[PDB]
Amino acid sequence: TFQCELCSYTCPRRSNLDRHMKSHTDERPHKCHLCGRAFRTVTLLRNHLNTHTGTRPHKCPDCDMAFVTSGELVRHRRYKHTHEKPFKCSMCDYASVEVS
């Protein structure tokens, strides 16, 4: 029912349309007090500051290294600890942690 004007975005929640309009309008009100980089939400700026300094809270349960976000630890476990490999190739027997 809900439709977009800038693109063919179709959702059922008005709040989803609101966020999509915020993405089109690029409301970035969160700057970094070290570099000119800016973001739209607080968690992005929090991770950016957790990269300018070493304050990595997501610790690896199987080794002693760490990362700022969860997805990086997910893929680290699928590379090094639980070799998942969901996506597989066409001809060869290849598979890896990322679609890239």
Grouping H, G, I as helix, E, B as strand and the rest as coil, residue 31 is: strand
Is there binding between residue 34 and Zn ion (CB under 5 A)?
A: yes
Is there binding between residue 44 and DNA (CB under 7 A)?
A: yes
Q: How many residues bind DNA (CB under 7 A)?
A: 32
Grouping H, G, I as helix, E, B as strand and the rest as coil, residue 95 is: strand
Is there binding between residue 51 and DNA (CB under 7 A)?
A: yes
Is there binding between residue 92 and Zn ion (CB under 5 A)?
A: yes
Residue from 37, 42, 62, 87 binding DNA (CB under 7 A): 37
Q: Are 39 and 48 in contact (CB under 8 A)?
A: yes
Rounded Cα–Cα distance for residues 72 and 79 (Å): 10
Residue from 16, 62, 86, 88 binding Zn ion (CB under 5 A): 62
Q: Which is nearer to DNA, 1 or 15 (CB)?
A: 15
How many residues in the chain? 100
Grouping H, G, I as helix, E, B as strand and the rest as coil, residue 38 is: strand
Residue from 35, 54, 93, 99 binding Zn ion (CB under 5 A): 35
